[PDB]
């Protein structure tokens, strides 16, 4: 209806570390449903960019540290509905995934939601009025810290003052979905 569906994913590392998204993620990612894609980077080649384009017309990608495409911006600020959203791959946040370092970027970008990746660990939490999302790695690709990476991605359902974030994780060989709500 009046909802805006945003797919948030990244750190695919195709084809160096993985060949494809999990079979059970691809069944759920069908064309014609998602309005926008925000990708944290590390695709890492044009084949995965083309795959995202089959899912939505509006694909937004920031530059990861293993991306072949050096034209992607380092970071991006977009507005969807009433929400300003920041996007960055996250290898620039020191130390990795530190919320103090993430918070300074939030203030620097003046965004309601900050999306980052690079850790391959899904996290979504609200902190001092602001919302922070890491979709993890959609392929479960190994990391330079690894320890059992779980494939995952995020869907944001944006309607009026609320964001409903859905987390899809591959745990065992079953897709577990969790739902977290954020209000501006």
């Amino acid at each position: 209806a009046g909802h805006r569906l945003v797919l948030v994913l990244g750190d695919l590392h195709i084809p160096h570390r993985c060949n494809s998204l999990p079979a059970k993620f691809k069944k759920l990612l069908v064309p014609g449903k998602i309005q926008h894609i925000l990708c944290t980077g590390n695709l890492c080649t044009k084949e995965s960019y083309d795959y995202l384009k089959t899912l939505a017309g509006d694909v937004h990608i920031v530059r990861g540290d293993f991306d072949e495409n050096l034209n992607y911006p380092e970071q991006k600020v977009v507005t969807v509905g009433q929400f300003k959203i920041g996007l960055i791959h996250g290898h620039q946040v020191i130390p990795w995934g530190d919320m103090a370092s993430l918070a300074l970027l939030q203030r620097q970008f003046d965004v309601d939601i900050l999306i980052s990746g690079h850790t391959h660990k899904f996290e979504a939490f609200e902190h001092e009025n602001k919302f922070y999302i890491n979709p993890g790695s959609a392929t479960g690709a190994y990391n330079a810290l690894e320890t059992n990476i779980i494939p995952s991605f995020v869907l944001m359902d944006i309607q009026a003052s609320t964001v409903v974030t859905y987390v899809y994780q591959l745990i065992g060989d079953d897709v577990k979905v969790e739902r977290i709500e954020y209000k501006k």
């Binding site: 569906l5 759920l28 990612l29 069908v30 449903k33 869907l155 359902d157 859905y166 899809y168 979905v177 739902r179």
Partner: peptide
């Protein structure tokens, strides 16, 4: 539901 979920959208997928």
């Amino acid at each position: 539901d979920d959208p997928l």
